[PDB]
Protein backbone atom coordinates (compact mmCIF):
# COMPACT_ATOMS: atom_id res chain seq x y z
CA UNK A 1 0.00 0.00 0.00
CA UNK A 2 3.11 2.17 0.02
CA UNK A 3 5.17 3.98 -2.58
CA UNK A 4 8.16 2.17 -3.81
CA UNK A 5 10.92 1.99 -1.20
CA UNK A 6 8.71 3.37 1.56
CA UNK A 7 8.68 1.78 4.99
CA UNK A 8 6.45 1.84 7.99
CA UNK A 9 8.65 0.71 10.84
CA UNK A 10 7.97 1.10 14.55
CA UNK A 11 11.02 2.25 16.49
CA UNK A 12 11.57 0.81 20.03
CA UNK A 13 9.90 3.99 21.30
CA UNK A 14 6.75 2.68 19.71
CA UNK A 15 6.63 5.16 16.85
CA UNK A 16 6.42 4.31 13.13
CA UNK A 17 8.91 6.30 11.12
CA UNK A 18 8.36 6.15 7.39
CA UNK A 19 11.58 5.64 5.51
CA UNK A 20 12.22 6.47 1.90
CA UNK A 21 14.77 3.88 0.90
CA UNK A 22 15.38 5.59 -2.42
CA UNK A 23 16.69 9.06 -1.60
CA UNK A 24 17.84 8.15 1.94
CA UNK A 25 15.10 10.39 3.34
CA UNK A 26 13.08 9.82 6.50
CA UNK A 27 9.79 11.29 7.70
CA UNK A 28 7.23 10.69 10.46
CA UNK A 29 4.40 11.68 8.19
CA UNK A 30 2.53 9.35 5.87
CA UNK A 31 2.17 9.86 2.08
CA UNK A 32 -0.78 7.47 2.31
CA UNK A 33 -2.74 9.92 4.47
CA UNK A 34 -2.75 12.33 1.58
Amino acid sequence: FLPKGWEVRHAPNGRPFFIDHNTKTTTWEDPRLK
Binding site: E7, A11, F17, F18, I19, D20, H21, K24, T26, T27, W28
Partner: peptide, 9 residues
Amino acid sequence: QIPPPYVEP
Protein backbone atom coordinates in the same frame (compact mmCIF):
# COMPACT_ATOMS: atom_id res chain seq x y z
CA GLN B 1 12.89 15.30 15.60
CA ILE B 2 14.86 13.05 13.25
CA PRO B 3 13.69 9.59 12.09
CA PRO B 4 16.45 6.92 11.64
CA PRO B 5 17.25 5.95 8.04
CA TYR B 6 17.12 2.72 6.48
CA VAL B 7 19.82 0.07 6.71
CA GLU B 8 18.08 -2.63 4.70
CA PRO B 9 17.20 -1.67 1.08
